């Protein structure tokens, strides 16, 4: 039956040939367990590729392109099989086809190819996929097609090692600046995941995202209705504030901190964790940045989470409270103890996580030194807590850095 | 990252 399909796919009779290619396509398209290996093994790929040249029969270009889309959606080995067959140049040709359904199906097939990894990505780029792919972005295009275009845009941004060439990023960013203004959720989500990926690849890429003009349009989406956009926006903006004080100030000057009360009280544990993670990277900043977090009424809300959050959120809140005791002035830390930090800040000394107890201690070590006169006054708030007796254990910890600190604090 | 059309 497969043997018949392949013979027939090369037929000089148009009906016989179209029915065969459509039958090859329906094997690949009609369950979620398609026989890709058998199709490849049967000699179909060259005929499907050759059908891509048949500008005279666009029904056949479409059906061949759909078959190849689904073969190239499998294992890297199956994707390699398509690419090995000289399919990419012919897909790129079909991006200039007058039949929309043929353009879209070519865009889809190149998405599966770009999605295989960075060599296939950099090959499709090197042949000029990005101009023609972005030029489909227009209001006139149907939504289902534009979603397939934004999904390919995510696939171009997806790999860090190596990331796409600087010049490709420079072509894609202007398209994301347009797409970030859309209302369709799947498109907004795809656009913000592209930005997550582009800002997850170190300070040069981050500067390109800033230079693009897009940050004032990204930060408002921290307050979008759909959690799925919020999760992506918070990631992308969190990636940017792992850069310089100056790169951070760009996010702060977009009024980012206005959106945090909703994130620090969000019902999803993960949105809380990433919000405190983000704020941990603002309090590791200069004293104006530390002050901005104070002025936005966020320190009390970071403490609630220090106390009553999942282990994950607490860890992040430890850091945000700790990072502050380092970067800040003695008035800024004064504000802290006035906000009942020491209780929920000492209740974490007894966790199996070395790094958390380590950063909790430093914070108490650093807070007492910078609270000069009122050093005793702090101790009587550590008694009531009953974290004095959890400091003892530390002194028995395997890890040197922790026990020293315990003794080093005992003295004073 | 890859999507079959079905």
Residue numbers in the entry:
A (entry chain A): 72 to 483
B (entry chain B): 113 to 118
What does the literature reporting this entry say, word for word?
We recently showed that LSD1 phosphorylation at serine 111 (LSD1p) is critical for epithelial-to-mesenchymal transition (EMT) and is entirely nuclear. nLSD1p co-exists with CoREST as a repressive complex, and CoREST is known to stabilize nLSD1p to demethylate LSD1's enzymatic targets H3K9 and H3K4 (44).
To assess the importance of nLSD1p in EOMES nuclear dynamics, we constructed two LSD1 plasmids targeting serine 111 phosphorylation within LSD1's nuclear localization sequence (NLS), which is critical for LSD1 nuclear maintenance: a wild-type sequence, and an NLS mutant with a non-functional NLS. LSD1 H3K4 demethylation was only detected in the nuclear extracts of MDA-MB-231 cells and not in the cytoplasmic extracts, confirming that H3K4 LSD1 activity is exclusively nuclear and that nuclear localization is essential for LSD1 demethylase activity in TNBC. EPI-111 showed ~80% inhibition of nLSD1 compared to ~30% for dual FAD/CoREST LSD1 inhibitors. In summary, FAD domain inhibitors such as GSK or ORYZON are unable to disrupt the nuclear LSD1p:CoREST complex in metastatic TNBC cell lines or disrupt the LSD1p and importin interaction. This indicates that importin-acting inhibitors and inhibitors that target the CoREST:LSD1 nuclear complex are superior to FAD domain only or dual acting inhibitors in reducing nLSD1p.
